[PDB]
Design an enzyme around this catalytic site. Sequence first.
Site, PDB file in Angstrom:
ATOM      1  N   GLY A 165       4.437  -4.184  11.120  1.00 11.91           N
ATOM      2  CA  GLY A 165       4.096  -3.232  10.077  1.00 11.91           C
ATOM      3  C   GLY A 165       4.031  -1.808  10.607  1.00 11.91           C
ATOM      4  O   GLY A 165       3.873  -0.901   9.794  1.00 11.91           O
ATOM      5  N   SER A 225       6.855   2.188   5.825  1.00 15.65           N
ATOM      6  CA  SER A 225       7.038   3.266   4.874  1.00 15.65           C
ATOM      7  C   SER A 225       8.122   4.262   5.328  1.00 15.65           C
ATOM      8  O   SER A 225       8.777   4.770   4.413  1.00 15.65           O
ATOM      9  CB  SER A 225       5.750   4.104   4.797  1.00 15.65           C
ATOM     10  OG  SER A 225       5.435   4.524   6.123  1.00 15.65           O
ATOM     11  N   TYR A 277      -1.293 -10.948   5.155  1.00 14.14           N
ATOM     12  CA  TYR A 277      -1.623  -9.740   5.885  1.00 14.14           C
ATOM     13  C   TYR A 277      -3.058  -9.316   5.573  1.00 14.14           C
ATOM     14  O   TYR A 277      -3.587  -9.681   4.529  1.00 14.14           O
ATOM     15  CB  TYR A 277      -0.689  -8.575   5.636  1.00 14.14           C
ATOM     16  CG  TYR A 277      -0.906  -7.623   4.501  1.00 14.14           C
ATOM     17  CD1 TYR A 277      -1.684  -6.478   4.643  1.00 14.14           C
ATOM     18  CD2 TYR A 277      -0.274  -7.834   3.277  1.00 14.14           C
ATOM     19  CE1 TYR A 277      -1.869  -5.585   3.598  1.00 14.14           C
ATOM     20  CE2 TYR A 277      -0.451  -6.943   2.226  1.00 14.14           C
ATOM     21  CZ  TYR A 277      -1.234  -5.835   2.397  1.00 14.14           C
ATOM     22  OH  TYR A 277      -1.366  -4.980   1.333  1.00 14.14           O
ATOM     23  N   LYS A 327       2.729 -10.310   8.062  1.00  9.15           N
ATOM     24  CA  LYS A 327       3.087  -8.913   8.234  1.00  9.15           C
ATOM     25  C   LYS A 327       2.017  -8.374   9.199  1.00  9.15           C
ATOM     26  O   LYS A 327       0.882  -8.167   8.764  1.00  9.15           O
ATOM     27  CB  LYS A 327       3.104  -8.129   6.953  1.00  9.15           C
ATOM     28  CG  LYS A 327       3.400  -6.635   7.135  1.00  9.15           C
ATOM     29  CD  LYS A 327       3.264  -5.916   5.787  1.00  9.15           C
ATOM     30  CE  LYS A 327       1.745  -5.672   5.569  1.00  9.15           C
ATOM     31  NZ  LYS A 327       1.521  -4.971   4.275  1.00  9.15           N
ATOM     32  N   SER A 376       0.834  -1.195   0.000  1.00 10.84           N
ATOM     33  CA  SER A 376       0.000   0.000   0.000  1.00 10.84           C
ATOM     34  C   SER A 376       0.881   1.262   0.000  1.00 10.84           C
ATOM     35  O   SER A 376       0.452   2.281  -0.538  1.00 10.84           O
ATOM     36  CB  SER A 376      -0.965  -0.010   1.163  1.00 10.84           C
ATOM     37  OG  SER A 376      -0.315   0.117   2.391  1.00 10.84           O
ATOM     38  N   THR A 377       2.111   1.172   0.505  1.00 11.74           N
ATOM     39  CA  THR A 377       2.984   2.369   0.486  1.00 11.74           C
ATOM     40  C   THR A 377       3.335   2.785  -0.930  1.00 11.74           C
ATOM     41  O   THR A 377       3.547   3.978  -1.228  1.00 11.74           O
ATOM     42  CB  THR A 377       4.246   2.126   1.314  1.00 11.74           C
ATOM     43  OG1 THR A 377       3.844   1.735   2.624  1.00 11.74           O
ATOM     44  CG2 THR A 377       5.067   3.414   1.366  1.00 11.74           C
ATOM     45  N   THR A 402      -0.103  -5.936  11.252  1.00 10.11           N
ATOM     46  CA  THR A 402      -0.361  -4.504  11.060  1.00 10.11           C
ATOM     47  C   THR A 402      -1.270  -3.909  12.113  1.00 10.11           C
ATOM     48  O   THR A 402      -1.392  -2.685  12.173  1.00 10.11           O
ATOM     49  CB  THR A 402      -1.007  -4.290   9.675  1.00 10.11           C
ATOM     50  OG1 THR A 402      -2.137  -5.178   9.611  1.00 10.11           O
ATOM     51  CG2 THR A 402      -0.085  -4.695   8.517  1.00 10.11           C
ATOM     52  N   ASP A 411       5.789   1.209  12.234  1.00  2.31           N
ATOM     53  CA  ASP A 411       7.104   1.791  12.455  1.00  2.31           C
ATOM     54  C   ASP A 411       7.235   2.436  13.825  1.00  2.31           C
ATOM     55  O   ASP A 411       8.254   2.307  14.483  1.00  2.31           O
ATOM     56  CB  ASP A 411       7.449   2.806  11.360  1.00  2.31           C
ATOM     57  CG  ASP A 411       7.248   2.323   9.933  1.00  2.31           C
ATOM     58  OD1 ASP A 411       6.513   1.332   9.653  1.00  2.31           O
ATOM     59  OD2 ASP A 411       7.800   3.015   9.036  1.00  2.31           O
TER      60      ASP A 411
HETATM   61  C1  LIG Z   1      -1.138   1.599   6.543  1.00  6.30           C
HETATM   62  C2  LIG Z   1       0.335   1.972   6.552  1.00  6.30           C
HETATM   63  O1  LIG Z   1       0.678   3.067   6.096  1.00  6.30           O
HETATM   64  N1  LIG Z   1       1.225   1.120   7.061  1.00  6.30           N
HETATM   65  C3  LIG Z   1       2.659   1.304   6.752  1.00  6.30           C
HETATM   66  C4  LIG Z   1       3.368   1.787   8.029  1.00  6.30           C
HETATM   67  O2  LIG Z   1       4.777   1.803   7.830  1.00  6.30           O
HETATM   68  C5  LIG Z   1       2.892   3.191   8.385  1.00  6.30           C
HETATM   69  O3  LIG Z   1       2.974   4.085   7.278  1.00  6.30           O
HETATM   70  C6  LIG Z   1       3.729   3.759   9.517  1.00  6.30           C
HETATM   71  O4  LIG Z   1       3.654   2.842  10.595  1.00  6.30           O
HETATM   72  C7  LIG Z   1       3.119   5.101   9.874  1.00  6.30           C
HETATM   73  O5  LIG Z   1       1.931   4.943  10.634  1.00  6.30           O
HETATM   74  C8  LIG Z   1       3.165  -0.051   6.267  1.00  6.30           C
HETATM   75  O6  LIG Z   1       2.925  -1.042   7.259  1.00  6.30           O
HETATM   76  C9  LIG Z   1       2.413  -0.432   4.996  1.00  6.30           C
HETATM   77  C10 LIG Z   1       3.216  -1.485   4.268  1.00  6.30           C
HETATM   78  O7  LIG Z   1       3.203  -2.729   4.984  1.00  6.30           O
HETATM   79  C11 LIG Z   1       2.765  -1.627   2.840  1.00  6.30           C
HETATM   80  O8  LIG Z   1       2.062  -2.633   2.543  1.00  6.30           O
HETATM   81  O9  LIG Z   1       3.152  -0.756   2.005  1.00  6.30           O
END
Ligand SMILES: CC(=O)N[C@@H]([C@@H](O)[C@H](O)[C@H](O)CO)[C@@H](O)C[C@@H](O)C(=O)O
Lengths: 288, 288, 288, 288
Positions: free
Chosen positions: C183, C202, C136, C159, C47-48, C161, C185
Site C-alpha cells: 500500500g 494513490s 486491510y 493490502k 481512502s484515496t 499498509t 508507493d
Molecule cells: C493512507 C494512504 O494515503 N495510503 C495510500 C498510499 O498510496 C499513500 O497515499 C502513498 O503511499 C503516499 O504516502 C494508499 O495505500 C491508500 C489506498 O490503499 C486506499 O485505500 O485508497
Amino acid sequence: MRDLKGIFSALLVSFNEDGTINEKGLRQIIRHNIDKMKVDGLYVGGSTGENFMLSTEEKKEIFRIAKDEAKDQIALIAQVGSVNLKEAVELGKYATELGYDCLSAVTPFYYKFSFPEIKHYYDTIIAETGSNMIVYSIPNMGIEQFGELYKNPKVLGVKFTAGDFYLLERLKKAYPNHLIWAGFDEMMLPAASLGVDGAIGSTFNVNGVRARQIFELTKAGKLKEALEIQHVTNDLIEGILANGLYLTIKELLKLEGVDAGYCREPMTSKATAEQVAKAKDLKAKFLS
Amino acid sequence: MRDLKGIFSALLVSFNEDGTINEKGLRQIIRHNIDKMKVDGLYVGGSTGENFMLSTEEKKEIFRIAKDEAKDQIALIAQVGSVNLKEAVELGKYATELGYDCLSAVTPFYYKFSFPEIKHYYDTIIAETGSNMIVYSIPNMGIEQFGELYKNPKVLGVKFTAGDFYLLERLKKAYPNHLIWAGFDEMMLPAASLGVDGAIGSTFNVNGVRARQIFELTKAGKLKEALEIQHVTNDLIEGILANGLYLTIKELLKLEGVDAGYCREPMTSKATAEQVAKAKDLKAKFLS
Amino acid sequence: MRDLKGIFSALLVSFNEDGTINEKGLRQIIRHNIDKMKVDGLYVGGSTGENFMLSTEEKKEIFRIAKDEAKDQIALIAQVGSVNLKEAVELGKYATELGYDCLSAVTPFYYKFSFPEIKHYYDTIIAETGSNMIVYSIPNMGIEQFGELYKNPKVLGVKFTAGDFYLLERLKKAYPNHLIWAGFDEMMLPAASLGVDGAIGSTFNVNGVRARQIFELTKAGKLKEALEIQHVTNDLIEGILANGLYLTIKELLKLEGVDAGYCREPMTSKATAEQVAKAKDLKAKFLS
Amino acid sequence: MRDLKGIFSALLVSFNEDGTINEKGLRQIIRHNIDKMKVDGLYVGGSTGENFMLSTEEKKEIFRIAKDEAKDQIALIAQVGSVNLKEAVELGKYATELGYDCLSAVTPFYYKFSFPEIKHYYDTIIAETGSNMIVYSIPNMGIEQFGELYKNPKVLGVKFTAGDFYLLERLKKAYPNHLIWAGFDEMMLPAASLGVDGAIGSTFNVNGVRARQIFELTKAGKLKEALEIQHVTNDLIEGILANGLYLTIKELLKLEGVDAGYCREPMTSKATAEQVAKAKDLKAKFLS
Ligand SMILES: CC(=O)N[C@@H]([C@@H](O)[C@H](O)[C@H](O)CO)[C@@H](O)C[C@@H](O)C(=O)O
Ligand SMILES: CC(=O)N[C@@H]([C@@H](O)[C@H](O)[C@H](O)CO)[C@@H](O)C[C@@H](O)C(=O)O
Ligand SMILES: CC(=O)N[C@@H]([C@@H](O)[C@H](O)[C@H](O)CO)[C@@H](O)C[C@@H](O)C(=O)O
Ligand SMILES: CC(=O)N[C@@H]([C@@H](O)[C@H](O)[C@H](O)CO)[C@@H](O)C[C@@H](O)C(=O)O
C-alpha cells in the site's frame, strides 16, 4: 526509620563550566531547600540532579556532600538505580553507609527487561544493602506487577510518575499501607485527592512554599484554596517547562543568591540571554 | 582509513556466573566470528555486547581484549556512546589509542535531548579523539538533521535501526557518499535493495555465513536466491527471538565449542533447561 | 476470476464545490488511469477516494460510475468496509451485483474490536455476497491471525499498509499462495524485493508509468535501474506529501486535462495559489 | 436555557438479535436513568450508544425515541459527529428540530485532519444548525487550539476524555467560563477536584447513585468519603471492563428488569454464559 511522608525536593546539583561538581553551590542549593523551601526531605541522585550524565564517583560525591550538609535536619532518600546493577548495588551500599533513610531505584532502562528481571533487580539491591526501597519507572507497570514487587516487605511504595489516575487509585486501593509519592508537581492536587502520601518534585527547589500549601490544603478538603494555589503554581511550571526546566530552575535559584551553576553536558550547560530574561520574568510574576 | 563496508557482527561478550568478564570465552567468540563467520569486522561495545550494563573499566577491558585478539585481521568499530559525555570521550580516546578503526556512539538517552545537544555530543567525541564516527539512536531523526550532522566530515554515516524504509531511501538519495549499515538482520534483503553499504547485527555471531550471502546476492541482482536465504534466516531469527535473543545466541555458540558464558545481570543470567533444549533444536535445523 | 496482480490505482474522485460528485470529472480520472497510466486495475472506494466522508448512496454512485466507465477493460476492486457492518454488507452486495472482480474491507475502526469480532466481520461480508475479499487495517495483526482469516477460502490476501518488512516476509513465507498488495508507493521497491504480488496506491493516478517500471524491474532483478526510478518517484512523492496529498494529485490531474475537481469537506476542498503553483512545478520536473 | 452541568449518562441502546433497535427496551433504559439513576441528563448518540455502527436513519430514530421518552424531565445533549460532515449537519438539524438542548460532535476521524479543518467542521455544524456545541476527540490538541475553537461563542466547552490532568487544569485556568465534562468515570474524583462542571459516562446507566455521591462529595471538600465511594465504583468499573463493557452494563440492566437487549454487530452481540455469570456476581457485590 524516619517518617518519609510529605514534601521532597528532587535535589538539583550545581556544576562548574567544565562539568565538575561545584560543592559550594551544591551546599547552597541544599540550605535553600531546608531553610527556605521548608521541605520534609531531599531526593538526591534523581533525574533532576542530572544523575544519569555522571560517573559513579561523582554520584558518590554528591551523596556525601548532601548528607554532610543536611545532617539529621531532614529526611534523605538516595536514588541509586542504574542499567548497571553492580553499580546500583555499590551506590546503595554507599548511601546506606552514609545514613540515607531509604533508597530509590529507577527500573533498569535502555534494554527491554522482563518483569522477573526487574523484580530480581530490586530484590538484589535490597538484599545487598539491607535498606528499604522506593520503586519507579520511566516511560507502565500494573497492579499485578506491583503486588509481586510488594511481596518484599522492604519495598515501601512507589514514586508515581505516569499520568494515569485510574492506576493511581487502583494501587492505593489494592496496597493501602504502601506509600505513594506523586512525581508530577503540576498534578499535585488531583494526586492528593486520591490519597498520595507525599510528592517528589523538581520545582519544590523554588516553589516549596506553595507546594506544601496545595498538599496540606487538599488533605484538609480545602479544594477551592488548593486549586487557586495549583493554578498559580501551574503558570509558574508552564513557563519553566517552556524556558528549559533544569536551566530555568537554576536561574531562579541564582536570583535568590544561590550559586546553582551550569547544567552538565550533554545538556546545554549555559542559559541563553533570553532564557535568563524569562527566568527573571517568572521570578517577578510568581516568586516575589 | 580501513574499508568499513560489509558484514560486522555486533560482538557478544562472555560473562562468568558472578557477572565478571570471561576473557577466554570472549577470545573464543572473537575467533569464531573471524574464522568461522568470516565477517568483515566487529562492532565492539554495542547493545549486543551487554555494554550498557557494565562499568567504564569493564568497557575498556572488552576493548583491550577484542583489539588484542583481532589484531589487524579484520576492521574494528568501537561503540562508546553514553548518557555521560565525559565517559563517551574517555572511552572514545582509549579505543582510538588502542587502534580501533572508527568509533560509533548512540545518541544520549534517558533524558530528552534536543538536536543541537545531540550534534554537540557527536562533535565533542570527534574533536576530543580525532576519530571518525558512525551515528545511531534507539527508540527518529530526519534528512535535515542528518545533513546537519554530516557537516562534520568525520561523521561517516549511520547504523540504521528503525524499520522506516522510506526514510532509508531518502537518506541514501540525499547523501550518496555517506554510508549506511542496516541494524535489522531480519530485514537485510529490503535494506540491501535500497543500497545500504553493510550491516551490523547480533545474529551474525552464529549466522554470518547466510548474512553475507543475502547481502552479496541482493547487491548482485540475484534476488530469488537472496530471498530463499532470508526466509531460512528469518525462521532461525524467529526462533532466537522467541527463545531469548542473548541467551539463545550464547547457547548456539556453546554448541560450536565456544565458551559464550552467561548473560550479565540485570539480564537473566542463566538459560533454563527449556531454553537450552530449544537452542539445540535451532542448532540442528539451521546451523548444522 | 480475473487476475488481480500488478498495479492498481486507488481511485480518486472528482467533487463539485458543494461536495456532490462531479461524474464527468470522475469518468475522466478513470480514463486517465486506464489509457495513460496503463494500470492493471482500480481500487474503488478506498481512502484515496475520500470514501469515509460520504453517504452510502454517494458510495454506490461512485461504484456505478466506475464500473460503467471501465467496463471490462481492467480489473476492479470495491472497498466496502465500514464501522457499520450492515453498510459494509449493503455495499458489498451492490458491488457484487455491479460485477466487481473482488471486494476489500478495512477492519472496523473507531472502537477497539477483538480479533474474533474482526474475523466475524470479514466472514459476514463474504457470506452475504459470495465475493473474494482483500483485508486491510488502519493504524498490526500477526501471522497467527492472518492464518485464522485465511481459513475462509474467499479471503485472497492483504493490502499491506504498515511499514513492517519483517512481518511482510513472514506473511509471504507462511502463506506462499496468499496475495500481498503493497500500500506504500514510496516503498514499492523493497516490498517487491520480498515478493509482493502488486500495489494499490494513490500516486499511480499520476505516476503510473514509473510505478510499473519499479515493480517490473524489481521482479526482474534489475535493482540498480529500479532504485533510480524509485528515487525520482520519491522526489515526486515527497513534494506531493509536503504540498498536500489529495489536492496535489488532483491539481496534477488537472494539468493533464482531467477535471479532478475539489476535495470533499471536512478536507480542505480548494487548493491555495501556492499549492497550485507547486503542483505546476511538480508537473514540469517529474511528469512532462 | 437548560442547565447543562451535572451528571449525564451516555445512553446505551437496546438492540434486537438482528441488530435493529428495540424501541421498548430503549425506553426502559431511558426510564431507568431518569427515575432510578436520577441523572441530570442524557448524552444521546455517543460511542456508548453504539452510534458509529449505525445508519443515519437509525441514529435519527434513537434521537426521536429518547426525546419522546424523556420529554422535558431532564437535559438532553445530542452527539452528531461523523467523518461525513453533511451527515453531521443533517443529524444536527434533526436533533435541533426535536428540541435537544445542545449538540456535541467528535473531531472527524479516520483521516488525519488539520486544525483549520477541525475548526471549520465545528463552525459549519453550528452555523448550519443554529445550535450550541460541546467538542471532543478520541485517542490531544492544546490550550491554543481550544482558544481558537472558543472564538465561536456557541462552543460551550469540551467532553474531556484523555487522562491528562495537567491539560485539564490548564483549560479551566485559561477559559474559566467554558464548561468541562469529565468523560472517565473511574477518574471522576480527581476531575471534580479540578472543578469540572459535570460528567458524561457509560457506567452511570447502572451506577448513577454513587456517581452523584462522588461528584457532590468532592465539591463539598469531603475527599475521604468521596474516595471510598470512588474505590467501590472502581472495583465495579474494573469488573465491567474485564467482562466486556457494553455487554456487562446491558446484562446489569437486565437484572434490574430493563430489556437492554443485545449489542450491535461488529461488536459481539450476545453475552456468553461466563459473561452472564460475572454480571450476576458484580450485581450481587456492588449493585444490590
Ligand atoms: C493512507 C494512504 O494515503 N495510503 C495510500 C498510499 O498510496 C499513500 O497515499 C502513498 O503511499 C503516499 O504516502 C494508499 O495505500 C491508500 C489506498 O490503499 C486506499 O485505500 O485508497
Ligand atoms: C521528568 C521530571 O523532571 N520529573 C520531575 C517532576 O518534578 C517534573 O520536573 C515537574 O513535574 C515538571 O514537569 C520529578 O518527578 C523527577 C524526580 O522524580 C527525580 O528523579 O529527579
Ligand atoms: C536491538 C538489537 O538487538 N539490535 C541488533 C539486531 O542485530 C537484532 O538483535 C536482530 O535484528 C534481532 O532482531 C543490532 O542492531 C544491535 C547492534 O547494532 C548493537 O549495537 O549491538
Ligand atoms: C471510551 C468510553 O467508553 N468512554 C465512556 C466512559 O464512560 C467509559 O465507558 C468509562 O469511563 C469506563 O472506561 C464515555 O466517556 C463515552 C461517552 O463520552 C460517549 O461518547 O458515549
